[PDB]
Amino acid sequence: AEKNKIPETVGGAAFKGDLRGTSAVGLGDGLYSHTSKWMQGNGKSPMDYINEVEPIKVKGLVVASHGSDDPALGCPVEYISLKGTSYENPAVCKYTGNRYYSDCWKHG
Amino acid sequence: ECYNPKGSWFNPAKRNWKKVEIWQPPQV
Amino acid sequence: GEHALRRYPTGEERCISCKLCEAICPAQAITIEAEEREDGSRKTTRYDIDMTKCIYCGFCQEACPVDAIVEGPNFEFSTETREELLYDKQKLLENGDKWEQEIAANLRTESLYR
Amino acid sequence: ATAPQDFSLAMKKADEIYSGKTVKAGDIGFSAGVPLETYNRKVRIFCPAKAASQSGLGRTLHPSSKAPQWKIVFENLSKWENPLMGWTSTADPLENVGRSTLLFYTKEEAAAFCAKHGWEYVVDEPNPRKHIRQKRYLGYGDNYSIKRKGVPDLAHLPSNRS
């Protein structure tokens, strides 16, 4: 099945039905998942870690994301739009993978 | 004898790092 | 000392596949290839370092913008075969997990200077 | 196009003062001492075209550019993957020398170098680049010209209507 499926993105930091940018690594071996290509075990993947973390509520229409708590010990400062975000469909920090959502746009 | 590359003979699922999928002929 | 890929406290790898560390490597010891992950993140499908070609300059630790790659404090990593000295993403991540607290303390001390 | 007016001045002046003695084609290749099978390889003398991502004209043959832009490149040969680590393996000694270091100001210079060493070469001229805007949008004024929909019809005027 996976041999003839179109590579797709789940949509956490992307959209539900988009193409996934893919290189040809693992195509001969027969591996078609991102984590399978570099991890050969059966342990929990870092993607499994990041999904387990829950979205965090913030006030405002923009949140400053430094990745870590200290600005100089993490990702570059990033400003994420909170417009059109809810718990089910949160905004994502591209560097860290943290998820955010706000109710301010609904005048709350 | 714990860590070896994924292309090693010891590796359970040995990897030939081919970047092209090859056509499989139809049966019979 | 010995190289180690690092993870965020959540368990997500810090690497974002900018590939600057591979461009700055004087010895060409780093080979990186990446992809879009299913969630949508920019993550590496391959990150291998040749420790028989590394010169331990630390330029890769200087170039990384997210502190993903660090040279850990371990100098007892001799091996009996050369194949074990060709590290890969899983091995580097395991080394980062093993030495996480010491590396974090060293980075907290070093942040003051730079 | 005017002049660099820097070290390149003395570079060009050293070029024009001095000259090289003529030798028969291919004789220098024997003096080089490299394997003679190197000269069996074929040569392409070309100038890279502009990358579509960027709009800078430095890499192109433009009066702005003052750097050597004509490369000698050899044909691509077999490449495979390392069975252990999937690295790209090669047996071509001349893989990157031509792209990296063989840069020439003029096509005749590269042709002379190839004929001096005995390499057979094919020169490819770049597709000419002419910075000519089309007649529809020749200038900023043409954006708001009557060409868009014609001269305004005045049959809607109340005097013409009545």
Added chain:
Amino acid sequence: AWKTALTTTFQELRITLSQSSSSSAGAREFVLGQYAELKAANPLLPILVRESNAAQASLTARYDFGVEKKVSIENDSASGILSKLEGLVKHGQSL
């Protein structure tokens, strides 16, 4: 007469000529005057007229089994072209 027999004889006929040249003037006259009649006599025969600025005028006939005979047609009048084509047909008969 002999114009009917090109199909039986030739598998293909090639007319190479220069687009604008003094040497190929006769070939151009030949192609713009007799090509229609030769095609009318031999409908299914491929008569290929191929031209380039630096091209050298020639008349090539391919016989069965890939045997090709090339005849130079440079600086020859249109009538001479026809005679040379007749000689090509006779040579094909000889095979």
Added chain:
Amino acid sequence: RVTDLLIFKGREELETYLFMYKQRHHAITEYIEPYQIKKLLIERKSSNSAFLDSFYEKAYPLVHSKYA
């Protein structure tokens, strides 16, 4: 002039052996062994032309072959 350079380089090659810069194994490896191998070589006269043999061997003829 190129002839002069070639002669000077050949004189250098001779002087290396004469002055013991190169060793016995160098002389064995680079001159004597290939000549003896060539004498001891038995080959079947290939009915295939030169093109066919290289076509069967490899896609790019310019790449060398080892241990032929």
Added chain:
Amino acid sequence: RDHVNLQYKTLIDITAVDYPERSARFEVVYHLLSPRLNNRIRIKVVVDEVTSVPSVSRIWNAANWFERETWDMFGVFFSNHPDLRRVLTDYGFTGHPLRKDFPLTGYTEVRYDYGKKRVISEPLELTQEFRYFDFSSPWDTLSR
């Protein structure tokens, strides 16, 4: 060396630079010191592959090895040199490595063979090829 006002008693080094774009490819560079003048001077002789440069060993004894190295690396012949021999490269090396047309990795490789109990030279094979990263910008202006 011997002019009263200009006393360049020292030859710092002798060097060549390969310019393949030029007909006269090689520029042999001489670096001198005057202790009296506390000054440095640079002398350049532009030649090609076939022409030779007279040796200056009689003026400065230090030149001998520098000219031998220039002959080894670039292939510039020095006339009337007492004994012009290669210095740096391996015995039997015929190519001149610092020429811009010489491959960075070379043409041959060295390995020990078990069958023939000798260390032997073979044509080059690379497990991982040298990766040239083209960093040039179109917008740069300093490149001449």
Added chain:
Amino acid sequence: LPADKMEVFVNGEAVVVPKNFTVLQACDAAGVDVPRFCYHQRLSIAGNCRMCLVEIEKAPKPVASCAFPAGPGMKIKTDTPVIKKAREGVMEFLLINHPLDCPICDQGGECDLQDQAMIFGSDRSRFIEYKRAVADKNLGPLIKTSMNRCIHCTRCVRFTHEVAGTSELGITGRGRDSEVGTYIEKLHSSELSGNVIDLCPVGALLSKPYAFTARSWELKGTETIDVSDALGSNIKVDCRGTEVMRITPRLNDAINEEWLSDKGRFQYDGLKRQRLNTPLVKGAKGLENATWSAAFDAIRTAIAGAKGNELKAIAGKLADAESMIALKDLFNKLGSGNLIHEDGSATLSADVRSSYIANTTIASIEKADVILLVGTNPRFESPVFNARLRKVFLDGAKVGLVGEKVDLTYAYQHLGADVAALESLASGKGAFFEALKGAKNPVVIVGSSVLRRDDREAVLKTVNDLVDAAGVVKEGWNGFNVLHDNASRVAALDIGFVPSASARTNPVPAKVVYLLGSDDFKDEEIPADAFVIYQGHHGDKGAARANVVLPGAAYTEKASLFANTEGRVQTTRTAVPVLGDAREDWKIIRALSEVVGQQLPYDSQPQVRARLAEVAPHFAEIGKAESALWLNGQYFKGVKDLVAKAARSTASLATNISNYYMTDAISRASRTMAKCTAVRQQ
């Protein structure tokens, strides 16, 4: 200063330029390079970024070079300190709200913004406030959006309006919170959609298939041509190791200005899938691995049985000139003239070059006054050609279509939908006929559909009648054009890869069929008891029906010759090495010729090129289009009886391209094209 030329002073140096240039054009002519972000040669002038500011002695304040007309005696200063300070200030304003996304941006090594920041900007910032934030929206399967990185140039909007003509993108908003994109959730529908990615300077629009896979410095670029269609678009294939990573266009004003169609841009994905690597010989267990010698032995045993016209060759869309001349020589030596092209226009005459090529060059169509399109949908057949037809429509050319109603980007007059309408138009009863006659530069474009019609002879005779009546072919202007949908068709016609007189006169059931990359053959072409040899690089319908499969290189892996619809001969380069036990196709055919006992004279690629030059002299002139003598009338006088023999069919002039994204084996293998097709079909 002859007439139109004027004189301008740039930095105190005299430059002679035409009067219609602007300040930026003269600065480029002077060798000075001005920083630009929104100005594009082939797009409407905008003037919004304000990075091109120079100094004119007459003007008090700096002016935008891109939109300022140059004047006689104007002095232009591009290095005054005020201009340097203005450049630095504009650069600061561009960077204050830009996201710090350089490591995660796929424009990292190829960004205009970074390079001009380094060259024409300060090394430090004074901004401490909150930056602007935008929410990205889907524009389709091929375009990824990071609108936060968007500097508000209007290149994407100007392209979508003037060139693409779908008019989907606009600047919605006012002030700093102004945003670019479709206001509704819409997906970019043009087949020229990929070009906005290249047009975007700051990576806000990026290629979704080529996402996070490589950096610019890692890639080796080889300049080759695109075989996706018969335009022969000039492209640059970027490769890392043995993998093609991305394909981007090159500048060639003759053919593709700088635009590439989406199919050509994103079909490299199908070069990694369903590939043939080894020779396969059929057995009771099916197609199985075999060596080159064993496959050649099987082909020899098969050919021994067949004789004469029982040997049949079908060439594919992607076959090159050298392989086709090789196969032609081999089969003529064996004694066969049954050489056909898969399209279905097998019997099209190759006699006169003017009959099957675009006699008006692609560049010269710019000067057309009236254009007639017969039975062609130029959008699907060649999107870049449709872009040029849009450009000429913008100038004011009047366009008429004699085929089915299709959604061409521009507006056109629908003359008719069936052959009878073209017959009436040729006879002279039409207002559009009086427009074609009146026009000084009339162009008639006939599509490949007319070539693939069972009644092609009389339709072509009617088209020639229209040519003669309206005088589209005259001295100094030949207005007859035929647009082709396949790369190998013009080359096959040029070399003479046409059925012989015997093959057409007496059809013979083929006993051995040779497929030269033909995966689109009609099923009746192979008698279903024939011995099929498939030579190609993907496994498809052709390979499935093969007793012997011979692996061959692709257009990215071989140095091969292709002829355009205009007949311009262009050549490919070997971007990546051949895969597995595959070989160059002409070498395969020559080796097979030696095996079967009919050895071919040539033994090297230059000898093959010399053979092509002998068969057709223009093949020696690589890169140059050769004019065709107008011999079309004499041909139709020759085929008088045949055109009368041709009957009438109950078919209407329409394109044969059902789906644009999949038309060849490479596209069918491509996953990206499949996603595009699924998006369109929902």
Added chain:
Amino acid sequence: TNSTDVFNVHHDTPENNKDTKFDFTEANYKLVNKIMSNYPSNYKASAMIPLLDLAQQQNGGVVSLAVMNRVAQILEVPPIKVYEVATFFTMFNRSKMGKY
């Protein structure tokens, strides 16, 4: 303290979405014709703002997606132009509006 419209992109809502149908009433259509008469026939897009104001007044104060699509169809222009103009100006309200 943001105003009525916080979005510069279309926010799907049960009231405002693609299926919603808007058309001018016959008297409003006569007003449309009178509005258009003021501008030349070939340059018909000049009436975009008066028509959008008229549709806003008819539709109770909200410029919906159906309103924009209807105006674009009547003016024979790509809808993106009407989207841009409806988004640029302040008086155009693209969210539900009260009585006052």
